[PDB]
Design a protein around this nucleic acid. Sequence first.
RNA 1: GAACUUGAGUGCAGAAGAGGAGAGUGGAAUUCCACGUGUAGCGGUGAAAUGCGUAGAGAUGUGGAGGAACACCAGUGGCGAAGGCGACUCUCUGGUCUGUAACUGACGCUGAGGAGCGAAAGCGCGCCGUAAACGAUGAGUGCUAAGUGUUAGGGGGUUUCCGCCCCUUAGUGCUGCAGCUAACGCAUUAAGCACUCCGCCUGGGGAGU
RNA 2: AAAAAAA
Lengths: 101, 85, 95, 264, 64
Amino acid sequence: NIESGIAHIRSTFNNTIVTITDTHGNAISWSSAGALGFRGSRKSTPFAAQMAAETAAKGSIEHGLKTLEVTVKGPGSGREAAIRALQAAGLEVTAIRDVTP
Amino acid sequence: TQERKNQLINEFKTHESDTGSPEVQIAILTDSINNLNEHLRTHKKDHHSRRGLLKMVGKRRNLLTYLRNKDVTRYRELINKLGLR
Amino acid sequence: MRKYEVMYIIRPNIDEESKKAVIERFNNVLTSNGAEITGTKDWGKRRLAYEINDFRDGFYQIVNVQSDAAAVQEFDRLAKISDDIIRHIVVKEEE
Amino acid sequence: LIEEFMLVANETVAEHFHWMNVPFIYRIHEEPNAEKLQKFLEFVTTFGYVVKGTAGNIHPRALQSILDAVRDRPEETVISTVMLRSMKQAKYDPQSLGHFGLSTEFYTHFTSPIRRYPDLIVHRLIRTYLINGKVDEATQEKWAERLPDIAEHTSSMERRAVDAERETDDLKKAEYMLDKIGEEFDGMISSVTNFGMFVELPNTIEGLVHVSFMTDDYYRFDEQHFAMIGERTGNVFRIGDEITVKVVDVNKDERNIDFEIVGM
Amino acid sequence: KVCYFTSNGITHIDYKDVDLLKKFVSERGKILPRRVTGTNAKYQRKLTAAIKRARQMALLPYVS
RNA sequence: GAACUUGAGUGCAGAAGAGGAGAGUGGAAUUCCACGUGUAGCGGUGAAAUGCGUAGAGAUGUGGAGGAACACCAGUGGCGAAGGCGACUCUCUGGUCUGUAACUGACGCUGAGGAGCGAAAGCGCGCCGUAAACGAUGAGUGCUAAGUGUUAGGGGGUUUCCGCCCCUUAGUGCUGCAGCUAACGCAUUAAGCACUCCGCCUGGGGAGU
RNA sequence: AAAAAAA
């Protein structure tokens, strides 16, 4: 049971993972386009991004999260939708970060 | 430093307003050379500094040579006082 | 000697008494090594832009001094060692 | 100055008649389209902003807080333009539904009855309800029957007027520039469609630049990052960029103006 | 497009003035180019040292 | 022999710089691993195979490989003799530019040989040290239309500084006369017109043998 | 392609 946390979205060209953690980086929950049953083209899409983002977000709200810091990696098209999806799930987003090298 | 430079000028000037005499110039150069030789003793691999030195030494030598042909007395006085060969 | 501006961040998890001890210690370090303190501001607890040694805030001090390298370099040496001063920066003032 | 006075007058009249609970005409502005706004909120996340709101229920203040932040930046014209593309239109209506753009729940037009029929109606309703004191049920039922048709008609006539005024502006804008052939101008990239590029000159005159005139490279429209991406030369033409352009084809009849990429 | 530093008679930018420097970074933290802030090259360089000195002492953030 | 100040240099004032050697420190990546949580896919994708893994992977946090570099700024911008030189701070240190002329009074230029610096080399920090180590153009000096941009200064103008205009020094670009050129081109950063000194060439192979 | 508001 924790309130504040980070959401590490990895949107690649092939897949969207979404982990959510605490401030110490311990995984609270996660979901992904592949674990959403999307396959091939669909895993790349921003539809599958929001699906995974919300699937893990709603998993985090069970543990009782409210505020998320986001961190993004990878060049995929999913970050845009996924981050809105964290706001649309209910969780308020503060600091955005794009940690893409 | 500028205070050192101000001592040196007063010590070696050939009249009151003189800063442009070889005596003066060589004195100043002599100090800069001794300070930079010291710099290079610690920082051996500081090549770009060494190039600067080599030009300073050159500037010295040309002034001394200049002095030597102008007035040999002044030339002797100056090399003794500074401690050059 | 030449003007410097010594700015450091004391960790946010200390008492004001312990804080004053740090300032006095480090102002003593500088003056002991032949510095003279012209100024000593205190910005107070500010939020850091990022997390330093797992602290999200810290007590900014800002000491103007006039000294030789030895003073500043001694401050630098001890400010590294000290676990109270989490970060610092010496800077020359450009006249 | 005059804007603010007319606004407070209009709000005060609208508020009074809301609390009177009689049939009245209002000037409403709905909340923005949730799909278009969704694309806007994504778009402003490309730059690292976070808007404290959802696409269903965004507060006007949140959209102002973006507009303030971007002031004097490379993300100023871009954001502002995509915020408009998510905005709607205002219309008259008998129901007090609020004015999103002015962030007030009570708005009507009272202050221009020479030139707006809904202002002449408000004046008659003021004379009916306040001056004559006629707040009987039969008077209300008569106005309640008449106002919806007036509101819908007048809102249609406003849109028709604005479209016509713009059409004539764009028409005479070409007429002005039937001698600008060749003359280069330093005007910003105002829009990037897939069929070319649209460049506003400082004086609010826009013109087109197809890949037909993007002669150097085979550019491509990145929707997510609102921009033109060339590959053969490796170029980048985002929106809001200060660039140079030349008038080639002012065809007045269709109200076309064309540019060419002089450069950036 | 004017140089803020020339315009307002400023000769020395200070890495301690956080809100002054803040006008010359993006939200992520990226130093905004001369072409967009209209700064003079002289000051752009003074500005950039200051921003980096700021960043070191956690007055400003690092990029994205 | 004497005299001189314009070349050269010293003062004095100011200026800019990723110039050099030290020595600390910053954020980051990167990812060998050890382990903290977590738990089913991670994927590669023409999209599938190809891999793979629950014995906990991916994603994820701190020891940590700790060795490398410094995203924005960043500019055919700056500095350097060249090769080069870009996080921040301090320490030590080299050169250049502008202004004033207080001083010296030709102290200057070039420079075989020599010495030093000097890539991936090539190879045991050492040697090696040849090098599209080719803006394909030696150094120094003076002279010979313009126009325009940019970097670091100076003088002036109105004008409150700013701003905007004029003049000027040094650098760095673009365009362009005269002249030069086989042509292409170069053109006050000359490949023009001159003088000093150095390096170098004399058909292609054979042969850099 | 084009928001309020004003004309």
